Amino acid sequence: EVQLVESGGGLVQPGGSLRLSCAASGFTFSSYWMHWVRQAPGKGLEWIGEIKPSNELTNVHEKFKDRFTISVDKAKNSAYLQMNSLRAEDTAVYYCTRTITTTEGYWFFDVWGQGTLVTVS
Amino acid sequence: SQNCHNGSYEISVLMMGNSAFAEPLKNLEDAVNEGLEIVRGRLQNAGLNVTVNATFMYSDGLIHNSGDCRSSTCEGLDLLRKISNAQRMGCVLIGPSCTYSTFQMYLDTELSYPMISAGSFGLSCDYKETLTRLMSPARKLMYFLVNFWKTNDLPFKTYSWSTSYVYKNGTETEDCFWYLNALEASVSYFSHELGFKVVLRQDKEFQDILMDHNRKSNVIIMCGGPEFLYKLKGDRAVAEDIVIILVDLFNDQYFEDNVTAPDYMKNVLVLTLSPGNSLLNSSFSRNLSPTKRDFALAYLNGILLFGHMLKIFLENGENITTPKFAHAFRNLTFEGYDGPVTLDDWGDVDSTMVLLYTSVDTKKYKVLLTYDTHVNKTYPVDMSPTFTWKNSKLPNDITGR
Amino acid sequence: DIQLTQSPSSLSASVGDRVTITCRASESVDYYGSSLLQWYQQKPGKAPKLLIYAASKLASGVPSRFSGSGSGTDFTLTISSLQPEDFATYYCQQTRKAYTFGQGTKLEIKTGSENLYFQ
Ligand SMILES: *[C@@H]1O[C@H](CO)[C@@H](O[C@@H]2O[C@H](CO)[C@@H](O[C@@H]3O[C@H](CO)[C@@H](O)[C@H](O)[C@H]3NC(C)=O)[C@H](O)[C@H]2NC(C)=O)[C@H](O)[C@H]1NC(C)=O
């Protein structure tokens, strides 16, 4: 079974840093692009960025590029989200997800992590 | 495997733009349509009740391929543009370029879609397994020049040449740019077979060498028309022992009876292709007139080559989706528009090349020698030419001190 | 970024009813005849789950009562014969330019004497 397990969430003071982990199970990690998506009340869902584990090519959205960093540990089959200079606006439920391409060439998020809450106060 | 089935044969025609040929794609479209009518006639006459239609995939994009991918989305988008193109693509792809189609040449498609290019002069296209070139590649021009340079057994050419100047300013036509690029490239057969070779990039550099008694070579190779040489040379005189090899492969003006030579094309040897065995006849040949007559002609012969291969494969009784069809566009002589068109083992158009000279007595262009690219052999035509040079013989490659 | 606006913000219906949720894009999400629009169902407590992809294609295992429609900038998710299990928070998602989601529509309701709201 394809699975994504998250950890590292909790309380952080403003200006502080936090590292999230996306442990993966039951698949070829290098092949699928790993993404980080946050969810805050009245903010719906928000895409942070992505990483191709095969060549470690990262693509973080312009809004988070300055303080958010996405990395992978190929040996541990895991993706990570390093968040720096955290503010009250970063208080959200963080998710790790993967994109799958169908036979017809359509790509989307299929499997998601259980989610981990990050609180900034 | 959708547009190449039982009595349904489709030809994918790429009509790009802002290349050498930005010329009304209507002309090119009219050439393709004329070719289709001959093919339909040929197949109906062979007793084959099949339909041949053409999908005109107009582009004029010159977009960057999958090599550059900013993100994952980029890749996914590339793959979706690919599948759409693959489903619409037919039996054969007739187009003007070479390698943007090569990341998608390895996509399944119809087992490396037989590609027929009416261009792709560059050395980068040499030896490609599914590529057919219906216009003389730079490789064939290079083979002629090396063979001609080594020749020292002719009564007019008594020296083996080893030195040359290659004029290239960067304002030439696409064909000329690639031909001069092949002579410029260090890895080329010409460069390997040349002990002294210097590329002249400025108009002043060329002009200064025409008079310099201390020059390292008497031979200058350039591409373009006689009007280009006149503007470049100007009122400046040319040293009595200088040979200018003007590469103008797609100009039939030299074979017209009313043509007198200018008085500057006297120390000039013109390398052109054998005149179209038939010229100035059809209504459409009368209105399409530059070297683009030959550009459009390849497009027409491309349809005829497909029609010839379609008949053959169906006669024997095989399929077209086979990778065989794809790798079966070489070592053949098919029936073109103006005559028989022969393709070598690599799928390139063999041609007869003609080296012309200005006769001092008549002031007319005369055939000095011919070069068959199929057998890679030179045949002398005029054994006693009337040159401007001493004793009516080609001077030595180095300055005779 | 391609902004996705959903309508309504929240809606209520009974078990067996036919419901419609609309998604409007700031710019066309189409590419070579395909509309790169997805429909995700986020059940309370759980993580987003794909229902519809490529504007109308049903994901593996998703019931036939869910259906997607539309092109360019306007899209519609239709849930016919609503079942109690189809009462979560629905979202639209586009893949044309990077990845963006709609604000979300909430299907909170009345079943019988059992009422399943959201707040
Ligand atoms: C006159 O005729 C020939 C073509 O009309 C020229 O051909 C040389 O032979 C081969 C092609 O016919 C090329 O060589 C290699 O052949 C192997 C065969 O299995 C291919 O895989 C290779 O890809 C191809 N070479 C490479 C390293 O890619 C030759 O390269 C081609 N010649 C040259 C110099 O390029 C003859 O050159 C030409 N004249 C004479 C007298 O040689």
Residue numbers in the entry:
A (entry chain H): 1 to 121
B (entry chain A): 4 to 404
C (entry chain L): 1 to 119
Original paper wording:
The intestinal epithelial receptor Guanylyl Cyclase C (GUCY2C) is a tumor-associated cell surface antigen expressed across gastrointestinal malignancies that can serve as an efficacious target for colorectal cancer immunotherapy. GUCY2C is a receptor expressed normally on the luminal surfaces of the intestinal epithelium and certain types of hypothalamic neurons. GUCY2C is activated by the hormones guanylin and uroguanylin and the heat stable (ST) enterotoxin from Escherichia coli to produce cyclic GMP (cGMP). PF-07062119 is a bispecific monoclonal antibody with an anti-GUCY2C arm paired with an anti-CD3 arm.
To gain further molecular insight into the binding mode of aGUCY2C-scFv and to understand if structural details of the aGUCY2C-scFv epitope-paratope binding derived from the isolated GUCY2C-peptide are recapitulated in the context of the complete ECD protein we co-crystallized the full length GUCY2C-ECD with aGUCY2C-scFv and attempted structure determination of this complex. However, progress in our structure determination was hampered by two factors: (1) limitation of crystal diffraction to ~ 3.5 Å resolution and (2) difficulties in building an adequate template of GUCY2C model for molecular replacement search. As expected from the predicted AF model used in molecular replacement, the GUCY2C-ECD possesses a bi-lobed fold related to that found in the low sequence homology member-associated ANPR and NPR-C, with N- and C-lobe each covering a central β-sheet flanked by α-helices. However, comparison of the GUCY2C-ECD structure with the above two reference structures, as well as with the AF model, clearly showed that the GUCY2C helix H2 encompassing 68GUCY2C-peptide87 adopts a different orientation and a more distal position with respect to the rest of the domains. The structure of GUCY2C-ECD bound to aGUCY2C-scFv revealed that such spatial arrangement of helix H2 allows the binding epitope residues of GUCY2C to be presented on the outside face of the helix enabling the recognition by aGUCY2C-scFv with two prominent features. First, aGUCY2C-scFv binds exclusively to helix H2 avoiding interaction with the other parts of the ECD structure. Second, the binding epitope resides on the most distal part of the structure relative to the membrane, underlying the importance of its location for effective GUCY2CxCD3 immunotherapeutic target as discussed in more detail in “Discussion” section. Further examination of the binding mode of aGUCY2C-scFv to GUCY2C-ECD revealed that in the context of the full length GUCY2C-ECD, helix H2 retained the same binding site characteristics as the isolated 68GUCY2C-peptide87 bound to aGUCY2C-scFv showing remarkable similarity to the binding interface of the latter.
